[PDB]
TrEMBL record, chain A:
Assigned GO CC terms: cytosolic small ribosomal subunit
Protein family: Belongs to the universal ribosomal protein uS5 family.
GO biological-process terms attached to the record: translation
Ribosomal protein in keyword set: yes
Top-rank lineage group of the source organism: Eukaryota
Keywords: Metal-binding, Ribonucleoprotein, Ribosomal protein
Residues binding Mg(2+): L83
Protein name: Small ribosomal subunit protein uS5
Automatic annotation (TrEMBL), chain C:
Organism phylogeny: Eukaryota, Fungi, Dikarya, Ascomycota, Saccharomycotina
UniProt feature, compositional bias: Basic and acidic residues: 94-110
Protein name: Small ribosomal subunit protein uS3
Residue numbers spanned by region Disordered: 94-110
Similarity section: Belongs to the universal ribosomal protein uS3 family.
Organism: Kluyveromyces lactis (strain ATCC 8585 / CBS 2359 / DSM 70799 / NBRC 1267 / NRRL Y-1140 / WM37) (Yeast)
Residues of the full protein shown: 120 to 229 of 237
Amino acid sequence: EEKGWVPVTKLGRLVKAGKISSIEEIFLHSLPVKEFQIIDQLLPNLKDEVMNIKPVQKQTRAGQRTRFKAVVVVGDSNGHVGLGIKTAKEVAGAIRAGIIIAKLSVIPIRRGYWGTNLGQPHSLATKTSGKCGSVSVRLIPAPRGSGIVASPAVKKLMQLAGVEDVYTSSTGSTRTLENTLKAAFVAIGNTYGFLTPNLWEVQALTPSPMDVYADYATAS
Amino acid sequence: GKKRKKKVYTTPKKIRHKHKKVKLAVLNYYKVDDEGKVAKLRKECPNCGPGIFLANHGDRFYCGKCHSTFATQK
Amino acid sequence: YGVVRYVMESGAKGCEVVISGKLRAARAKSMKFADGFLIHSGQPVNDFIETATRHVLLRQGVLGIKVKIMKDPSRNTSGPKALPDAVTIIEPKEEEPVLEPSVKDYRPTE
Amino acid sequence: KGRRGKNKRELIYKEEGQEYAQITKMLGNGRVEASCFDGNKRMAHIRGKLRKKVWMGQGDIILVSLRDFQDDQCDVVHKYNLDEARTLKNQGELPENAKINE
RNA sequence: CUCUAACUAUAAAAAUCUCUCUUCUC
RNA sequence: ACCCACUCGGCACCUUACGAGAAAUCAAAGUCUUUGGGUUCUGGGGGGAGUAUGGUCGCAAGGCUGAAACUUAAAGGAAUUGACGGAAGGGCACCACCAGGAGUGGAGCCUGCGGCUUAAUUUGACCAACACGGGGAAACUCACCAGGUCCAGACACAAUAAGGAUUGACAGAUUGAGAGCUCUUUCUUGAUUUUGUGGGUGGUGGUGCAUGGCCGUUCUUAGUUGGUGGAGUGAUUUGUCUGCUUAAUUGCGAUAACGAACGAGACCUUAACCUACUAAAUAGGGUUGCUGGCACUUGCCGGUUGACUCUUCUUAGAGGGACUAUCGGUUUCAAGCCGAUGGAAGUUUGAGGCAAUAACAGGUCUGUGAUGCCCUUAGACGUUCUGGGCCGCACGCGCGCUACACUGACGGAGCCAGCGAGUACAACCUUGGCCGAGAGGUCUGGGUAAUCUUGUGAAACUCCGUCGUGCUGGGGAUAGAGCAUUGUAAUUAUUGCUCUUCAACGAGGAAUUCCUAGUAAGCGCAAGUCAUCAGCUUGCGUUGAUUACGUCCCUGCCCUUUGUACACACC
RNA sequence: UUCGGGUCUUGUAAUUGGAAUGAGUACAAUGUAAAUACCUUAACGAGGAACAACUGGAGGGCAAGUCUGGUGCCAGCAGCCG
Ligand SMILES: [Mg+2]
Ligand SMILES: [Mg+2]
Ligand SMILES: [Mg+2]
Ligand SMILES: [Mg+2]
Ligand SMILES: [Mg+2]
Ligand SMILES: [Mg+2]
Ligand SMILES: [Mg+2]
Ligand SMILES: [Mg+2]
Ligand SMILES: [Mg+2]
Ligand SMILES: [Mg+2]
Ligand SMILES: [Mg+2]
Ligand SMILES: [Mg+2]
Ligand SMILES: [Mg+2]
Ligand SMILES: [Mg+2]
Ligand SMILES: [Mg+2]
Ligand SMILES: [Mg+2]
Ligand SMILES: [Mg+2]
Ligand SMILES: [Mg+2]
Ligand SMILES: [Mg+2]
Ligand SMILES: [Mg+2]
Ligand SMILES: [Mg+2]
Ligand SMILES: [Mg+2]
Ligand SMILES: [Mg+2]
Ligand SMILES: [Mg+2]
Ligand SMILES: [Mg+2]
Ligand SMILES: [Mg+2]
Ligand SMILES: [Mg+2]
Ligand SMILES: [Mg+2]
Ligand SMILES: [Mg+2]
Ligand SMILES: [Mg+2]
Ligand SMILES: [Mg+2]
Ligand SMILES: [Mg+2]
Ligand SMILES: [Mg+2]
Ligand SMILES: [Mg+2]
Ligand SMILES: [Mg+2]
Ligand SMILES: [Mg+2]
Ligand SMILES: [Mg+2]
Ligand SMILES: [Mg+2]
Ligand SMILES: [Mg+2]
Ligand SMILES: [Mg+2]
Ligand SMILES: [Mg+2]
Ligand SMILES: [Mg+2]
Ligand SMILES: [Mg+2]
Ligand SMILES: [Mg+2]
Ligand SMILES: [Mg+2]
Ligand SMILES: [Mg+2]
Ligand SMILES: [Zn+2]
């Protein structure tokens, strides 16, 4: 691969110069991401799988315009997930664009403990929920070694998350696959979005690494 | 854009005019004079050359090497 | 796509390949695979765009392939060197205007 | 609407369980009733490949196949368009008690 | 940084419609 | 009574989502998976059906209560894009109309369909089929029909078989045949064959609803599309727009849009303008020779491969020239639109050629040795030969032709073009001199081409005469005879010419076509087809107009808004 | 320098051997009231180990065929979509 890449998007300049060791500070400081090789460079271990491609059809005066909407999911199996939804004319182009979208939308997870912790927390910290369309998805912490009790789609999403045991409870028209995946995704993104006790104390409000390295960005 | 009817024939048959497998026409052609001279039979072709025997039909001896050339009365 | 990628690699500024026939099925189909850009109308269509058509014999029948290649006008010998509407403004050389009075003298020459 | 469509034939004789019949009236739902030339009024169903491809109407000699288990009903197969019907009357395979002309 | 003015004037009748519905995988 | 700042209560409203919802939307339809304020009453797919029955109130109408058997994979909700709308808005088009012009539809002819008939009248198209398949078929073309030949069945194997696989055959019978097709006979021929099995060819056989290619149409309009970006859960949307402007999604602009691509334009061919250039016996002109006629003044008109010279005219290269130029109006003064002048040209200068995305079950296997599949492959759907038809006739329909006459017909006389094309392995264009009334033939010519046909001396038209309102000298079909010409072959008349016959026809109902300047219309000519054949067709030029220079009323088209139970989309 | 040793392994062969053994028989004994049967065990009892595994299904739902031939909106299949 010839990954030439003039830096765009100062974040990109910093990562290319190597000032960003990994995504944690990005996610810490809520940095905007618009390009994918940032995820490629920082996380060299993204696995991906095209969940489903749907023929999406529009009606025009001359026959019907057909496109393909791919719903693809990328992850590391170690606590990072992204979901790409993308339509395009050719199937392969759709899949590649969806891959890029998913890498753009990588979101972290809070792998918690079902109780009486041990090494390497397996389950989710707290019950979370996510709504997309009629799909309301419940994620519940699960005892170690109970597996991923979930529908195949969200089960695969969980597997890409790296979580080992979670309970799921869906309601609505989960037949709609993109809605289901998107709901489960927003829910798993909500895993941080829940002030747990053990996280009480005020933090130090670290300077933005993207700020203090301004002089390496904005190529002269 | 059409279906064809079978070619029904009001004609009994016409078969290949089979050539006749002649058994030893040369004994018919020649005549041996007792371990010596040998004569030929019924003519020799002057239009074609020596050795080509002619045809016996009636009131005319006929060619067939150069068929149309020689058919003369004798 | 290998063909079109090769065409782009070769430096032409636009490629198109069209395949019609029984693509894996019975009902006729015709898919187009294009990249860059191609001009369709106007005499430059003959001036630059090469075109070829071939019939391919597959077990189910015949597949029509059409190839269109839009040659780069810059490297087009024996013809116009650019598109009809390609306007090339030229950068004017700059000079410093401070030399107002500047009386000058050369030696007289025969 | 011929562009949506699939886009001098000969007669066919009845063969061991089928008969020429004359439609007496056209019944609804796609059915029909025809007199078979046996002194009987049978109930014919307009078969597929036939429904809205080639039409038929009253007073038209038409081929119908019987169903071996229930003689009281039958299904119509092949239509005859008013000129080989005269030929059918000529060849005498079916009784000529029913002449149809306008 | 001072405001609230124009306006027109038509209709008659037109009912129905036989098929054939067919994939998106790199 | 008002003004202000209030506050309590009421109908409500606007903005927004940071909450909800599936959304439309809601300040409650929020405080609901992070699921619990208190409470009543309703529903569990749609139909059956608020129907059956029993109660109950009512005079009656009927109300409340209230099923089931059974029948189905949907019904339904909201929104999206299209289509559609006898919905709205703003723009367009002589394949729409207006003003009109020319007509077609009436007549006879021709030609193509249908129908009928036939052995065959071979076939495919039903705005975008019908003078189309270049389809102007006498043999062929060939597809159909009556018939006769032949195998153009490679190759593999087996089988016969060299005491011959076999082929060919005069003459006769027989055949339309002078076909050894078949036969009588006899001959000739020699391993290329023959007959069985595969196998392969061939096919204007079928299947354009298997297909490629091809063009036609949707669609002569101006419309398409992706990349990040925003909106939506999404179908998608914005960019592609409120306005004005243009022929144009053409620009001015305004703008959750930004920059880009196709289409339009730009571009190419042609038409025009170049006393500027380059030149020219395959184009012209001047002077000047040598000659003809006349006037005689040295003037004209002519001829002339003489000499010199020239290039305006004719050619074709380089180029030049216009871009709305200049000015006056109008225009949020911008996009442009209008008017005058200059000009050759001021409609995109006129006419064109290419011409986007998507699509059609549009046509074409009958153009192809483009082609899948299927069919046939020896008395054949192969191929060939003879003859018939494709052109038949109770009828209807579409292109066109000649006419209905006086702006005419017929005689004379005048005498002007522009696109072409043209003989080779064969035979074209044909000048001229002959003859014939004519078609024509004849002998010599020139021309493989600005050279010759050719200045294609064309028609309408122009001038002078005859005819005279008469179905008449209009009209020329239908009809006999003759002379020729192409053709192996003209009968079922190829075509031309000569004479005679002279029919139908009185400006053509409802309808309907085409068209805005060198235009319509009239008028021919050249080329395709061609041996011979046009009424067709492409192109060309000539004589050359009436009437608009506008509008959505009919028929459609663009886009926007809106409504929909439509999506095979108002058939 | 192409190699090719298969150098190390895996599979695939109507090639090819010798092992091992039960289902079945069956001496017996045990087992039982008597017995069957089991649990043991003599001797028998595998080559195609014919000592033979069926039942449904291969468009989706849903794992598996765009293989062959047949029928040709018929027969039929299909819980639904078809
Ligand atoms: Mg363009
Ligand atoms: Mg069709
Ligand atoms: Mg039926
Ligand atoms: Mg009716
Ligand atoms: Mg119900
Ligand atoms: Mg009801
Ligand atoms: Mg009651
Ligand atoms: Mg609705
Ligand atoms: Mg009019
Ligand atoms: Mg006329
Ligand atoms: Mg007429
Ligand atoms: Mg016919
Ligand atoms: Mg049209
Ligand atoms: Mg002819
Ligand atoms: Mg003929
Ligand atoms: Mg013939
Ligand atoms: Mg024959
Ligand atoms: Mg052919
Ligand atoms: Mg088609
Ligand atoms: Mg986007
Ligand atoms: Mg849009
Ligand atoms: Mg253009
Ligand atoms: Mg000049
Ligand atoms: Mg001005
Ligand atoms: Mg033009
Ligand atoms: Mg177009
Ligand atoms: Mg074929
Ligand atoms: Mg043939
Ligand atoms: Mg004809
Ligand atoms: Mg008529
Ligand atoms: Mg026509
Ligand atoms: Mg006259
Ligand atoms: Mg005259
Ligand atoms: Mg001329
Ligand atoms: Mg003349
Ligand atoms: Mg007269
Ligand atoms: Mg005339
Ligand atoms: Mg023609
Ligand atoms: Mg106008
Ligand atoms: Mg019209
Ligand atoms: Mg529908
Ligand atoms: Mg209707
Ligand atoms: Mg067994
Ligand atoms: Mg089965
Ligand atoms: Mg089985
Ligand atoms: Mg499967
Ligand atoms: Zn001889």
